[PDB]
């Protein structure tokens, strides 16, 4: 069970400032919601030895902290204490509707980034809602109004391979075997390939990038909290994005 690796105190010490009034998602993300959701995904934080389960959770909270960070360079307790500050895409996001007969856009509904993985677009809310048996296509606001659902979308993303792009789960648990194409593209198992899976088109293969360095900093802080050392191949600066 995942609760033997991650306690309420480890969750709270990682997500130290999420409940500050400056965070729009303050009061949303609970340890209970996380454990309820985690238990629905067989293998999630229960694959491998203790250090491998710790590493998976460090990596999962690292990446999701980046997706939702409200941190700045000089924030209280540093930038890597301000994960899980947002539950919806910032700026003025549009409806993120790309029509699908399989996963049709609901009238008046918007599919902008919500929750810990910032799940976006009607196609993804529909694929996800099918997998977790929730009406995300008709009510995408559930991902920001129900914290158990919010965590389910992020773990769903984390556990789901995309053809030649592995699950974050496989990579974080040392179960990803890189293809010859992967090797030629510099995609060596590590946290960097996880950044590549999540947003490599934007962030990877272009040299030093502050968003990548941010993802690493969260993961480094959380490895410390779990009492493990970070893995190798932390960045994707010299990785070709997954096409
Ligand atoms: C609202 C919040 O607490 N945090 C920050 C904001 O103040 C910050 O300066 C900027 C990037 O550093 O984006 C937000 O996420």
Author numbering: 79 to 321
Sentences from the paper on this structure:
A class I chitinase from the carnivorous sundew plant Drosera adelae was successfully expressed in the methylotrophic yeast Pichia pastoris and efficiently purified using a chitin affinity column. Enzymatic activity assays revealed that the enzyme showed a specific activity of 235.3 ± 10.2 U·mg−1. In D. adelae chitinase, a characteristic tyrosine cluster consisting of Tyr174, Tyr199, and Tyr201 formed a unique structural feature that enabled recognition of the (GlcNAc)4 substrate. The hevein domain structures further indicated that the tyrosine cluster (Tyr41, Tyr43, Tyr50) in D. adelae chitinase may be involved in hydrogen bonding and CH/π interactions with (GlcNAc)3.
Crystallization of wild‐type and E167Q catalytic mutant chitinases yielded needle‐like microcrystals. X‐ray diffraction experiments were performed, and high‐resolution datasets were obtained at 1.73 Å and 1.57 Å, respectively. Structural analysis of diffraction data revealed that only the catalytic domain could be resolved in both crystal forms. Using AutoDock Vina, we performed docking simulations of two (GlcNAc)4 molecules at eight subsites (+4 to −4) of the catalytic domain of D. adelae chitinase to investigate their binding energies and conformations. Further, the structure of the chitin‐binding domain (hevein domain), which could not be resolved by X‐ray crystallography, was predicted using alphafold.
